[PDB]
Design a protein around this nucleic acid. Structure first.
Ligand SMILES: [Mg+2]
Ligand SMILES: [Mg+2]
Ligand SMILES: [Mg+2]
Ligand SMILES: [Zn+2]
Lengths: 14, 83, 52, 104, 39, 263, 221, 94, 1112
DNA sequence: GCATCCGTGAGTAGA
DNA sequence: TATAATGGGAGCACGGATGC
């Protein structure tokens, strides 16, 4: 829902 | 089938009317998909287009009426008579 | 029918040293009763010069 | 001809491109000094038409004698300014994007 | 309004909707306007 | 994008939305061209989608896009079409019209049922083109433009133009309308009678039909232009021609208040 | 954040900076990558903000100038205990700056306002609704120009067709453009002197007809 | 109330037809400069000026008053449109 | 003239300072009069204490602040369009933790708006008022669950934007659920985070049967506070990695952080009173020694269970109780926005602390004041509660400052407000006025503070009462909040008293608002006066007890619309509240101390006091207010006059000798007149115009700018292309109209030229140029002219120029010119009149004096009101005002009749008798007996049963006069009006709504940009809106062509309207209309939505309405 | 059948 | 153009088609 959070999570996977 | 005035108005065949009532997005999407054609039967449609409403003096029963004085009437009558 | 005051441009004004505003002065000048003795006389200009 | 009907239907990308008089490649509006529309921006006269009646951008053809003639120098068609109300542009997306109306 | 047969071409729809709607502000189980809209 | 009075600029929100879209698109193309990794491209594509969404229908999905230093949502296409402020209801099913005016209504008894008091100045501005043509037909002005310039300043107006204005409106009717218009008698036609003063004189018997009283109600005036419009207004819409309510069938114009009292 | 660009936008531009850094980095210098990358990230973000923030685009150098003017005026307002004048900012900006220049720089830095900004506190009204259209001709204007063409034709009909055509070609009423004396002379098959003389006598007859009838005066505004 | 409006409504099967007839007839009158009128000189609508009685400038009044007489014929498909126009232009040039 | 006053009620205390709700608030917020070290923690002091210290140089801390003197005075601020304000400096010290380096500096934070003496502000030269805002008080409440009868919802409410509403509920499955930010989670979890254990909750909450079992969850008590904290964090924050310190930070910020979560001082007090506990801080819990510690939650849950059980002593809360609703005054609102801007400044401070040189930093380098200035400026400019001040008359301003809005930021949004909030609560008694509220959509949302009422330090409204001990009424006055008032039996103020003792064995009182009959032994308190129940405006209505509520509302409201009149007088019948209203309005000028008047002038009054010092009072003369009503102070004293302290020096606008004068006292008759008074219209006499009654001065401001352009500068000049000397006659050498010149519509106020746009001359212009042999000028005429239906005399001109001393304009602007045009408006047909009782109407006729109905002695009446207005409206106060007014007309005296303690019918009959002796006996002495007409009228009255048969004509005329009816002769006939007619003095006001400002017409004019439809409004010379419902009217009439005209030729069809105008000026018939531009706009906007809209013929073949312009 | 999700809630004037 | 820096910040209502 919240793009910032989703991108932070995608970033966190690396 | 019975349905209240709101749903009845939204369900009408003219998409300009339905879109100009409410739920404009919904109406426009379903209409656009179905490739719907508005035949301009009712008042609202013709009001949007700035056309002459099909009621009162704009009725198909009246507006075609002609007025002619007896002089011009005889004048055309003889032209029809000679041919 | 008319009023001129020296150093006064228009009706809404205050003359220094004077308590009344020009509107009130005119309101008083409306109550002036002026009798003409001569029947041939259509207009008169009264002059008032005062001080102190 | 008289208009007896009004039809509404989906637009193909080809339809959209056929409506378009040019692509808007730049997110710019008007120049900060000249106060005239920027080339390939949102206000470009090349695309949407001229600002002044029967006159191009640089002023080569200023009269109705040239009508339909597109200037070689500034690329602006010489015609009525009212077309700026009527002329569609377009934006070519790098990737497809859903029309929110049909998703939501 | 004319106390005679209606003239062909009169729009009776708008006349109806107006006829029903106009008194609506005067309307005071359910009673009055809410019930009307319920119907 | 328009330069206003003071020399500043005013613009639509659509330009901002389009700017967002174009920017994210271009950045996406450049990102691809430089072969960015998948996370960056995915994010950019997502943002592009949300940009298109905000352009078409804003607030539909997610947070509504706003301008810097503002909590006001940008106005998108969908917002332009729909709503009470939308294109259909605001600019299509109703419009603001020329040849119209408004003023305070005041009673007068002298009026016949088919008449109403119309202030001179209002009549001058409402009928102005007809007044120009008539001023040209008579000797008051050499042509149209001279006449208009003559009407421009209030001290350039002479009595000939008033008598000419009387000659203009003869037989013609105007429409009077009071909001809210609850039924078709909220608009009625009257022959104007030019009166000194700034108030519109209304006939007592039509008050009930208009639901108008004298506590400071205001009415709007309209001028039907074409001979067709005039024929319609005079035959169909004339006050004296509608005496009965289309709803109940009972007389709409009937004695009330002081009239009933006296009788 | 808050510079006119969205968080995610700043993130993507910073990503572009990061890519530039990865391409330009040299591990031979023993530095950590973060050190070199930070420069390109900041650079990319600042370039981004300077470029994309304003609806009317201002060149990056000019932006920097405007910002320096801002910080200057802010320093002055912080020292003086009040907002500075143009002259004070002009002083504090050094040589080459006067009041006029500061004023014009502030004028050129003005951002546009939304047509949809609500006026009155309500859902009812929009600012753009109060702004007239100065472009499209008013009905009065259309009427004026129409009556003008009609009156000019009424005036040109009192001449012979040749001299009236000469005037129409010389003032461009025909094809839209004004012909030179040699073109009209070559069109009617006469010397340029002759066609100029015909133009003169036509203009003269028109001036006489005008002095007599006083018809075309009102259009002169 | 418009004079004889009752009789005028009696003439037509629908009031809107009366309206159309009146409007069109008035358009004819305006176009032909009143020269086509079916009214006698004593039957002419008058307007009181500063000077004296002049012909009524209002073509609608004229049209209705004419319609009251019965000298006008109204209906559908009386004559092709261009034929009526041209015959009227012949009889009463504009 | 002699003033007789009625009533037996003696007011113990005076009305408190009326604007104190404003003044004392802002003062309390600023604390500019207090030395910095003595300042309380309330006000902007609180903001500095909350924002600072700023950590992570490492530390920036707050020492003190100060406010300087205003750079410009009020009047100058109004002149130059400047905000009246004072500079705000803040002393801060930077401290590096490691270094120990201490750098101290005083930084400039910008300016703050100062409140004027009368309780208003000046923002950009425009006077504005900050309206107080009523809202739900912070605290803990318990309300019935609407869904489940027998179950209750506990609510914990902090201040607005001070953190989350929290809801405690007992779920259908038995567990106790907590809701925060719309997230339902078991309360047990948070309780475990708080450090509670199953033992403590079992002993504490066990007393309430089986409820506590829903609170028992083994999995929750099986983990330490840390694990439950991380679990709670994962519950409230999905996707956010569950780091420990992050969880602690978020939970602390959500509950225990005073910088984020704050109850009110009111909230604290109320929660303490309700739950029966003590709160250390204003938060729900604390962080102490590494862990979270409970304050609020447990007693709250305890009260919830106790209520749910039916345990006595626990009750639901009325949310409309005025103990549960508090008032946020101007000080608190400004303080809030200050807190916001200050916090933004702090974020900027930290962001500055990370960057830059770490060793060299000063408080001047760290602090950017722009966000604070922005927050303050935005609050004072564009906020909802910040309203353009209503100065129409002094009472307007006074009432405005006393308004209470339920709307605004953090307040109720409209249409979401049900009958609950708009209702009159039983606790509004003595607090909020049940009468004065706007009619329509704003009803009940906007209200007015009661007269004696006060807003305390906590924000609750208090009303005064008198202590009654053992049937004796003390003069001790106790101010009470609603909750305190609920505790006592309070008797009415009209209660009979002999001395200080209650004289009746049955007294009318209130217990919790409920009316009850009690003995003097049961009376704890007594009302101060009936005046305390109503507003200041409602208190100005004489005989209010005889007027129905709604018309009373109307009169009360309309009194603020009253226009100041040049001859204005105070009412013949007053309530006595007039002088106070004038004095608290600061309209009138009063003597500061005892002394002698040295000098008297229209401009200035000079007074020598006892001290010997010479004080000069300059007088405001012909000043334009916000609404354009004239503001001027007239000297009421003469040179050498001996004055005391507080005595009247100069009369303000709408003031007669210090009494509030909102209108004129006129002689009215109540009777139908020839249908001219039909349906609320009014008939007035020309005599009113002759003596200048109802005549008012109005100033209008006109403005024009000359700016720099790319085509060359605009300039104000007397040189205007193509204009005669006739047109330029009244212009001065510089192009600005001279002072004193009369202007009319079309006249030039300021001449200005503007360089023409790029001009390619059309061949017509070229040929014309050649014909007339004149060169087309470089500039065109942009001059400001008088708008239609306007104008007057030019009383002032201001001219500001770029490059001139003390003058700097907005960028690009060469010069600014303002013209002031004043006009004296006589009463005219269409102007609105009203009385204090709600009767209102427009003048429909002005009769010559000879036509007016007149008395036998020849005296014509001024105004004729229609009796048909009275019975259905049910306002009889105007009738009594008319009677008492008659008596006061013939006795030459005025009266004071307080509300609810009035003049009564018998007394008015006495006065009417005394008057009749004058009205008649004078005639009888002059040698005149009864008229024949009078005999006829008396016969009619005998048949009417109005007079007693057999008495002499004189006695019958007295019998009629005591009823306030007189014989009245028709001016036209000379015959009498068949019946006797009520005639008397009435107080009537000329309202701000005047037909001169209204009447408007348009032929053609400006059009909007996108739609090409005509603009709206008189100001823009716009067309009337023809709405959807109007289109319904035309359709229902079946008029097709009129409608088609409105839809095309008259609005948005460009070709059609141009062709129409040209056809009309040529004397042709308007052409056939075409497609309206707004439809094309719809089609294109639909194409922008990727929807193809096609207009087709009957063959389904495409038709182009764009005429090939849009097709390639 | 009861959990979401969503669209809409007079009119003119004015500003 | 290179010390190292690596996961955000803020914040009423009823009626009706759907969705689990
Ligand atoms: Mg009424
Ligand atoms: Mg009314
Ligand atoms: Mg310098
Ligand atoms: Zn070019």
């Amino acid at each position: 829902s919240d793009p910032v959070r989703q991108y932070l999570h995608e970033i966190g996977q690396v | 089938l019975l349905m209240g005035v709101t749903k009845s108005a939204l369900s009408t065949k003219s998409w300009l009317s339905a879109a100009s009532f409410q739920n404009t997005t919904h109406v426009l999407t379903e209409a656009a998909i179905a490739g719907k054609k508005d035949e301009l039967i009712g008042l609202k449609e013709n009001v949007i287009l700035g056309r002459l409403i099909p009621a009162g003096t704009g009725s198909d029963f009246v507006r075609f009426t002609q007025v002619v004085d007896q002089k011009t009437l005889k004048a055309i009558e003889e032209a029809r008579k000679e041919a | 029918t008319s009023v001129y005051i020296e150093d006064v441009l228009h009706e809404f004004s205050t003359i220094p040293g004077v308590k009344e505003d020009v509107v009130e002065i005119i309101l008083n000048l409306k109550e002036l009763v002026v009798r003409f003795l001569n029947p041939s006389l259509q207009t008169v200009t009264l002059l008032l010069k005062a001080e102190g | 001809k008289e208009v007896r009907k009004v039809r509404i239907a989906l637009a193909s990308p080809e339809k959209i491109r056929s409506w378009s008089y040019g692509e808007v490649e730049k997110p710019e509006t008007i120049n900060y000094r000249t106060l005239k529309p920027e080339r390939d921006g949102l206000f470009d006269e090349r695309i949407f038409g001229p600002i002044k009646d029967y006159e191009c951008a640089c002023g080569k053809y200023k009269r109705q004698r040239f009508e339909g003639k597109v200037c070689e120098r500034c690329g602006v068609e010489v015609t009525k300014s009212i077309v700026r109300r009527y002329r569609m542009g377009h934006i070519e997306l790098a990737t497809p994007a859903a029309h929110i109306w049909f998703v939501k | 309004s004319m106390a005679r047969p209606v003239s062909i071409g009169e729009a009776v729809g708008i006349v109806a909707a107006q006829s029903i709607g106009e008194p609506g502000t005067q309307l005071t189980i359910t009673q009055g306007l809410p019930r009307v809209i319920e119907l | 994008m328009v330069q206003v009075d003071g020399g500043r600029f005013a613009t639509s929100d659509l330009n901002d939305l389009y700017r967002r879209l174009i920017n994210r698109n271009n950045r996406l193309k450049k990102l691809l061209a430089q072969g960015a990794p998948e996370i960056i491209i995915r994010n950019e594509k997502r943002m592009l989608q949300e940009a298109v969404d905000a352009l078409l229908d804003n607030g539909r999905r997610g947070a509504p896009v706003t301008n810097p230093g503002s909590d006001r949502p940008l106005r998108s296409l969908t917002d332009i079409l729909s709503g009470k402020q939308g294109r259909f209801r605001q600019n299509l099913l109703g419009k603001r019209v020329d040849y119209s005016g408004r003023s305070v209504i005041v009673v007068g008894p002298q009026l016949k049922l088919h008449q109403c008091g119309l202030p001179k100045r209002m009549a001058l501005e409402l009928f102005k083109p007809f007044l120009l043509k008539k001023m040209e037909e008579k000797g008051i002005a050499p042509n149209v433009k001279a006449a208009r310039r003559m009407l421009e300043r209030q001290r350039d107006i002479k009595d000939e133009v008033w008598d000419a204005l009387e000659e203009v409106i003869h037989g013609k009717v105007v429409l009077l309308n009071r909001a809210p218009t609850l039924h078709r008698l909220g608009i009625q036609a009257f022959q104007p009678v030019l009166v000194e003063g700034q108030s519109i004189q209304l006939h007592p018997l039509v008050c009930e039909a208009f639901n108008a009283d004298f506590d400071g109600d205001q009415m709007a005036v309209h001028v039907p232009l074409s001979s067709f419009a005039q024929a319609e207004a005079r035959i169909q819409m004339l006050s004296a021609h509608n005496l009965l309510s289309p709803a109940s069938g009972e007389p709409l114009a009937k004695p009330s208040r002081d009239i009933i009292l006296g009788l | 954040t808050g510079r006119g660009l969205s968080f995610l936008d700043l993130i993507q531009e910073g990503n572009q900076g990061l890519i530039r850094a990865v391409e330009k980095f040299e591990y031979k210098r023993r530095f950590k990558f973060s050190t070199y990358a930070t420069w390109w990230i900041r650079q990319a973000i600042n370039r981004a903000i300077a470029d994309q923030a304003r609806t009317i685009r201002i060149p990056v150098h000019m932006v920097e100038t405007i910002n320096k003017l801002s910080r200057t005026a802010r320093q002055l307002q912080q020292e003086l205990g009040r907002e500075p004048t143009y002259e004070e900012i002009a002083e504090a900006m050094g040589p080459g700056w006067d009041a006029k220049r500061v004023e014009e720089t502030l004028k050129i830095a003005q951002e546009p306002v939304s047509l949809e900004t609500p006026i009155g506190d309500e859902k009812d009204s929009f600012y753009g609704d109060f702004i007239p259209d100065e472009h499209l001709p008013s009905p009065v204007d259309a009427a004026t120009q129409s009556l003008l063409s009609e009156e000019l034709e009424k005036a040109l009909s009192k001449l012979s067709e040749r001299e009236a055509m000469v005037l129409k070609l010389r003032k461009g009423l025909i094809d839209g453009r004004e012909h030179t004396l040699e073109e009209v002379g070559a069109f009617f098959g006469v010397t340029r002197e002759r066609i100029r003389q015909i133009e003169n006598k036509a203009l003269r007859k028109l001036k006489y007809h005008e002095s007599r009838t006083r018809k075309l005066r009102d259009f002169l505004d | 109330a418009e004079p004889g409006i009752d009789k005028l409504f009696g003439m037509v099967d629908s009031k809107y037809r009366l309206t159309v007839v009146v409007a069109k007839r008035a358009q004819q009158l305006l176009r032909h400069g009143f020269k086509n009128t079916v009214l006698e000189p004593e039957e002419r609508p008058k307007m009181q000026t500063l000077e004296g009685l002049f012909d009524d400038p209002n073509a609608v009044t004229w049209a209705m008053k004419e319609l009251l007489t019965g000298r006008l014929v109204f209906g559908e498909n009386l004559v092709p449109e261009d034929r009526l126009q041209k015959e009227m232009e012949r009889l009463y040039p504009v | 003239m002699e003033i007789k006053r009625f009533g037996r009620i003696r007011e113990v205390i005076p009305l408190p300072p009326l604007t104190e709700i404003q003044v004392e608030s802002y003062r309390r917020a600023l604390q500019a009069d207090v030395p910095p070290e003595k300042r309380e923690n309330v006000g902007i002091q609180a903001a500095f204490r909350e924002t600072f210290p700023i950590e992570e140089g490492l530390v920036l801390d707050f020492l003190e602040y100060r406010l300087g003197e205003p750079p410009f005075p009020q009047d100058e601020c109004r002149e130059k369009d400047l905000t009246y304000q004072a500079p705000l400096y803040a002393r801060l010290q930077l401290i590096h933790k490691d270094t120990g380096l201490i750098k101290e500096d005083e930084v400039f934070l910008g300016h703050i708006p100062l409140m004027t003496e009368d309780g208003s502000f000046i923002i950009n030269g425009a006077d504005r008022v900050i309206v107080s805002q009523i809202h739900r008080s912070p605290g803990v409440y318990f309300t019935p669950d609407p869904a489940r009868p027998g179950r209750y919802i506990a609510s914990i409410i902090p201040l607005p934007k001070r953190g989350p509403w929290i809801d405690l509920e007992v779920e259908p499955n038995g567990v106790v659920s907590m809701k925060v930010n719309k997230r339902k989670f078991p309360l047990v979890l948070l309780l475990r985070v708080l450090g509670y254990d199953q033992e403590t909750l079992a002993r504490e909450l066990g007393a309430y049967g089986e409820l506590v079992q829903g609170l028992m969850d083994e999995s929750v008590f099986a983990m330490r506070p840390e694990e439950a904290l991380i679990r709670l964090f994962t519950l409230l924050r999905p996707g956010d990695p569950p780091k420990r310190d992050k969880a602690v930070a978020y939970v602390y910020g959500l509950i225990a952080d005073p910088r984020r979560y704050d109850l009110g001082e009111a909230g604290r007090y109320k929660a303490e009173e309700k739950l029966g506990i003590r709160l250390s801080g204003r938060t729900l819990a604390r962080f102490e020694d590494g862990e979270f510690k409970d304050e609020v939650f447990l007693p709250t849950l305890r009260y919830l269970f106790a209520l749910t059980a039916g345990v006595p002593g626990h009750e639901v809360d009325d949310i409309d109780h005025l103990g549960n609703r508090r008032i946020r005054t101007v000080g608190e609102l400004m303080t809030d926005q200050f807190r916001v801007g200050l916090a933004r400044l702090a974020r900027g401070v930290r962001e500055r602390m990370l960057m830059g040189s770490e060793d060299s930093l000063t408080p001047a380098k760290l602090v950017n004041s722009r966000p604070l200035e922005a927050a303050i400026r935005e609050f004072f400019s564009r906020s909802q509660l910040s309203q353009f001040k209503d100065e129409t008359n002094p009472l307007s301003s006074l009432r405005h400052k006393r308004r209470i809005s339920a709307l605004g930021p953090g307040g109720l949004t409209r249409e979401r407000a049900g009958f609950d909030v708009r209702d009159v609560h039983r606790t509004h008694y003595g607090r909020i006025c049940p009468v004065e509220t706007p009619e329509g959509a704003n009803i009940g949302l906007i209200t007015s503070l009661a007269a004696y009422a006060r807003v305390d330090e906590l924000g609750f409204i208090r009303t005064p009462y008198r202590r009654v001990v053992g049937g004796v009424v003390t003069d001790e006055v106790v101010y009470m909040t609603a909750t305190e008032e609920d505790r006592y039996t309070i008797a009415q103020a009209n209660t009979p008293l002999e001395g200080n003792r209650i004289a009746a064995e049955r007294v009318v009182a209130r217990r919790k608002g409920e009316p009850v009959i009690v003995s003097p032994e049961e009376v704890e308190f007594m009302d101060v006066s009936p005046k305390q129940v109503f507003s200041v405006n409602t208190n100005l209505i004489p005989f209010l007890e005889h007027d129905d509520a709604n018309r009373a509302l109307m009169g009360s409201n309309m009194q603020t619309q009253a226009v100041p009149l040049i001859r204005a007088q105070a009412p013949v019948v007053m309530t006595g509240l007039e002088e106070r209203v004038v004095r608290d309005s600061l309209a009138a000028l009063y003597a500061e101390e005892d002394g002698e008047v040295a000098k008297v002038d229209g401009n200035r009054i000079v007074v020598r006091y006892e001290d010997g010092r010479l004080v000069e009072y300059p007088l405001r003369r012909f000043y334009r207010s916000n609404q354009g009503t004239a503001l001027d102070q007239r000297p009421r004293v003469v040179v050498g006059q001996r004055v005391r302290k507080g005595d009247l020096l100069a009369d303000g606008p709408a003031s007669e000798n210090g009494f509030l004068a909102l209108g004129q006292n006129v002689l009215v008759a109540i009777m139908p007149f020839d249908g001219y008074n039909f349906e609320d219209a009014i008939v007035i006499s020309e005599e009113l115009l002759k003596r200048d009654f109802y005549t008012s001065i109005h100033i209008e401001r006109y403005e024009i700018e000359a700016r720099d352009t790319k085509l060359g500068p605009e300039r104000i000049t007397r040189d205007i292309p193509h204009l005669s000397e006739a047109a330029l006659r009244d212009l001065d050498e510089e192009g600005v109209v001279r002072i004193g010149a009369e202007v009319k519509p079309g006249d030039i106020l300021v001449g200005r030229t503007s360089f023409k746009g790029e001009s390619e001359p059309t061949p017509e212009e070229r040929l014309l140029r050649s014909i007339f042999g004149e060169k087309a000028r470089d500039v065109k005429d942009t001059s400001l002219r008088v708008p239609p239906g306007e104008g007057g005399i030019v009383v002032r001109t201001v001219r500001l120029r770029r490059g001139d001393p003390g003058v700097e304009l907005k960028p690009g602007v060469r010069e600014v010119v303002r013209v002031y045009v004043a006009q004296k408006r006589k009463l005219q047909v269409g102007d609105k009149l009203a009385n204090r009782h709600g009767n209102k109407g427009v003048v429909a006729k002005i009769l010559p004096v000879e036509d007016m109905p007149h008395l036998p002695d020849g005296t014509p009446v001024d105004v004729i009101l229609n009796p048909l207005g009275v019975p259905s409206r049910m306002n009889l106060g105007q009738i009594l005002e008319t009677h008492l007014g008659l008596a006061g007309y013939f006795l030459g005296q005025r009266y004071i009749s307080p509300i609810f303690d009035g003049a009564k019918e018998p007394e008015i009959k006495e006065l009417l008798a005394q008057a009749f002796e004058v009205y008649f006996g004078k005639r009888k002495g002059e040698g005149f007996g009864v008229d024949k007409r009078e005999v006829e009228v008396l016969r009619r009255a005998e048949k009417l049963g109005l007079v007693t048969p057999g008495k002499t004509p004189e006695e019958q005329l007295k019998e009629l006069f005591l009823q306030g009816k007189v014989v009245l002769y028709d001016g036209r006939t000379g015959e009498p009006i068949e019946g006797p007619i009520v005639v008397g003095q009435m107080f009537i006001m000329k309202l701000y709504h005047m037909v001169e400002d209204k009447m408007h017409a348009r032929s053609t004019g400006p059009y909007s940009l996108i739609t090409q439809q005509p603009l709206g409004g008189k100001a823009q010379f716009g067309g009337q809106r023809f709405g959807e419902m109007e289109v319904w009217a035309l359709e229902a009439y079946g008029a097709a062509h009129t409608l088609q005209e409105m839809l095309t030729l008259k609005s948005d069809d460009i070709e059609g309207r141009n062709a129409a105008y040209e056809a009309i000026i040529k004397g042709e018939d308007v052409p056939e209309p075409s497609v309206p531009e707004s439809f094309r706009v719809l089609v294109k906007e639909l194409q922008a939505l990727a929807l193809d809209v096609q207009t087709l013929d009957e063959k389904d073949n495409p038709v182009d309405i764009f005429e090939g312009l849009a097709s390639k």
